[PDB]
Design an enzyme around this catalytic site. Structure first.
Site, PDB file in Angstrom:
ATOM      1  CG  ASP A  32     -10.982  53.132 -36.648  1.00  0.00           C
ATOM      2  OD1 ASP A  32     -10.958  51.870 -36.184  1.00  0.00           O
ATOM      3  OD2 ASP A  32     -11.896  53.603 -37.031  1.00  0.00           O
ATOM      4  CG  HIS A  62     -13.363  49.479 -36.713  1.00  0.00           C
ATOM      5  ND1 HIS A  62     -13.232  50.658 -36.586  1.00  0.00           N
ATOM      6  CD2 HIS A  62     -14.928  49.140 -36.686  1.00  0.00           C
ATOM      7  CE1 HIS A  62     -14.437  51.358 -36.419  1.00  0.00           C
ATOM      8  NE2 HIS A  62     -15.532  50.620 -36.710  1.00  0.00           N
ATOM      9  CG  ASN A 153     -23.038  50.820 -35.529  1.00  0.00           C
ATOM     10  OD1 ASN A 153     -23.468  51.503 -36.120  1.00  0.00           O
ATOM     11  ND2 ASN A 153     -21.892  50.022 -35.339  1.00  0.00           N
TER      12      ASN A 153
END
Ligand SMILES: [Ca+2]
Ligand code: NA
Length: 269
Positions: A32, A62, A153
């Site tokens: 990440d 995040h 998403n």
């Protein structure tokens, strides 16, 4: 005071904790934006594959948020992860904008395989296939890592990469009604779903924040895998993946939900 976010309760992680299953001894790599130091996290190590960014600290937020859903510490502050004793490794593959490259993600997966990680959490995606990405997923899987990835998403009826590849476990997002969140990508290759709306977790600056996304669903499954691995230390990545699917609560069509909602109580019975 410690709060239990709704998604942690919804996946029934506290029932597993009551059996003494917390993720102890399980190594979880978070691929990440990094993970920042935080009073409610314990970071064991990691590596950066972002050019000119040698630190694993999180310049975005995040990665720290994702990490707290996996493993926020069980104490008197903050929140509580699915696997609060898991060994967290920060593998920085995304820059501070949230952007990365195939090369940085693939290198992070190679690192995870070479360093004996049990689970790799990829709350990230790319819209296009990449043979380099597919090979890196397959290489990590062959070495023993369970790769868990977000479906994306966009709201579309296909899922992102590398989640779409056969050897990545693809995770979509549900809401508080146990419906698919409107943004959660679905379709061929979806394995399972988990809470992904209004997810409170750790955030840089020693604080907490609520976020939405399949990025937030994925760490619930990575954490559940760590609980199963602690209970069954001889099981392979593939056995853990199949057990999570077999013990999920069905929510309906597999095109929308995969096997359904991850259930850490049923998975550790
Ligand atoms: Ca805590
Ligand atoms: Na997949």
């Amino acid at each position: 005071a410690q709060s239990v976010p709704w998604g942690i309760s919804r996946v029934q992680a506290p029932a597993a904790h009551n059996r003494g299953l917390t993720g102890s001894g399980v190594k979880v790599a978070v691929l990440d934006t990094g993970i920042s130091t935080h009073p409610d996290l314990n970071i064991r190590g990691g590596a950066s594959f972002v050019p000119g960014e040698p630190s694993t600290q999180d310049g975005n937020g995040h990665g720290t948020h994702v990490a707290g859903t996996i493993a926020a510490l069980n104490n008197s502050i903050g929140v509580l992860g699915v696997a609060p004793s898991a060994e967290l490794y920060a593998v920085k593959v995304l820059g501070a904008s949230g952007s990365g490259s195939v090369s940085s993600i693939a290198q992070g997966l190679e690192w995870a395989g070479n360093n004996g990680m049990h689970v790799a959490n990829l709350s990230l995606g790319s819209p296009s296939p990449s043979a380099t990405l597919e090979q890196a997923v397959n290489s990590a899987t062959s070495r023993g890592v369970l790769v868990v990835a977000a479906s994306g998403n966009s709201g579309a009826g296909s899922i992102s990469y590398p989640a779409r590849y056969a050897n990545a476990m693809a995770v979509g997002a549900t809401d508080q009604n146990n419906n698919r969140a409107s943004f959660s990508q679905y379709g061929a290759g979806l394995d399972i779903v988990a809470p992904g709306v209004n997810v409170q977790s750790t955030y840089p600056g020693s604080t907490y924040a609520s976020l939405n996304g399949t990025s937030m669903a994925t760490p619930h499954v990575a954490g559940a895998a760590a609980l199963v691995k602690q209970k069954n230390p001889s099981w392979s990545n593939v056995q853990i993946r199949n057990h999570l699917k077999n013990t999920a609560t069905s929510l309906g069509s597999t095109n929308l939900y995969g096997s359904g909602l991850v259930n850490a109580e049923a998975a550790t019975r």
